[PDB]
């Protein structure tokens, strides 16, 4: 079977610049390389067929070239809308195979997160568990640090984080951190605090509440 190698697997470019994705076939595939774009939570969308023929409705900044075993997808001016995974596929011979995909990150200016803390709902507390959520909204770059403090005691091993993929409208990330305690442990303490550090914050940001206020 023909292996398609997409390397690098990750590309990061500034807006307005050109980017090129590489697809190399382990055997001759002629011109029979097709490119797909898959946005987060979306389905693959055919962009270019047969190395260089762009499909109807595809923006003109997308082009493709190559033949034999070496192929390139190019985006002449990159916008945040182009944030996606990009896959090549050969139909030179059977079975058809896909590359492993290259992810496009689009750089942007530093954006500090907006931070929000959520107490556990009264509803959940009746079930004997407390989840406390800290939200970091629409920040860049991706690196961020969240610490949980409960009556100023640093928490460990009882939180989990989730990060969105980069947003294709504003090139930012968002992050949730969820602190999970038993109701018994939750009611033993007063001050619940989420402390956030990020390149865009000149000093760490703390969001807190007092249990029952």
């Amino acid at each position: 079977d023909i292996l398609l190698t997409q390397s690098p697997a990750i590309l990061s470019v500034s807006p307005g610049e050109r980017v090129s994705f590489s697809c190399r076939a382990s055997q001759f595939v002629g011109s029979s390389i097709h490119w797909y774009q898959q946005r987060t939570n979306g389905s693959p969308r055919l962009l270019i067929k047969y190395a260089s023929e762009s499909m109807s409705g595809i923006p003109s900044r997308f082009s493709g070239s190559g033949s034999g075993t070496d192929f390139t997808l190019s985006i002449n001016t990159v916008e945040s809308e182009d944030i996606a995974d990009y896959y090549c596929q050969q139909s030179h011979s059977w079975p058809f195979t896909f590359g492993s995909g290259t992810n496009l990150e689009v750089k942007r200016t530093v954006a500090a997160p907006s931070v929000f803390i959520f107490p556990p709902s009264d509803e959940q507390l009746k079930s004997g568990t407390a989840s406390v959520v800290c939200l970091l909204n629409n920040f860049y770059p991706r690196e961020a640090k969240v610490q949980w403090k409960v009556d100023n005691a640093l928490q460990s091993g009882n939180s989990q984080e989730s990060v969105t993929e980069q947003d294709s409208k504003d090139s930012t990330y968002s992050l949730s951190s969820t602190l999970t305690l038993s109701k018994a442990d939750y009611e033993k303490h007063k001050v619940y605090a989420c402390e956030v550090t990020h390149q865009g914050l000149s000093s760490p940001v703390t969001k807190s509440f007092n249990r029952g206020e």
Binding site: S32, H34, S43, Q89, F96, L135, N137, S162, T164, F209
Partner: protein, 222 residues
Amino acid sequence: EVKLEESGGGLVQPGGSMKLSCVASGFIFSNHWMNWVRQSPEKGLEWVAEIRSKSINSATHYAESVKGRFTISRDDSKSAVYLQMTDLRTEDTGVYYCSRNYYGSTYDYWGQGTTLTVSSASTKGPSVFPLAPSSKSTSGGTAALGCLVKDYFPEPVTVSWNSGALTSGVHTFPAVLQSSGLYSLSSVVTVPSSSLGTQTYICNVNHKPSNTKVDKKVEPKS
């Protein structure tokens, strides 16, 4: 407009069976070759099976990794293509796309995918709790609120806001597997703080494997 719509995914034990369906519209179905293509973090995009036109004996072809276990079929009267999976393995887990291939070239149309989980664990429907805005969730003119969708299995759940009328500012986070073996996620949205208490915010959570369809109104607290 071409549309492809899959269904039938969900949870099944190792060694089990499951049949996926896809209904097509917007092209002459009986002339064209229908495919299943799956996607997983480990293997990426992977062609699974194809059935060609009745005019050429409805010929079927399978990836080597599913041959002898999967059967692809079609019903042209219903514009439907099916994938009967048997003897399922953990590594068959992933998102299954219905797709048209143009006579041995491009996959030129794709469905939205249906998720298969092969696992010995049981289905569990989520609990939905509000992430209630206050002033510690108000950043100037912007407030945040959301829904915590906790303790469910398997993936996926879908979350909409105000029956899909509210999409700007929404972030539905990737699910995280908890140490209990159950998933949890939050969906949040940022809104004008002036709209708290004057506009209604409802998260619509759907977890098909448990037939969970919950609408949770998220209000500021007391």
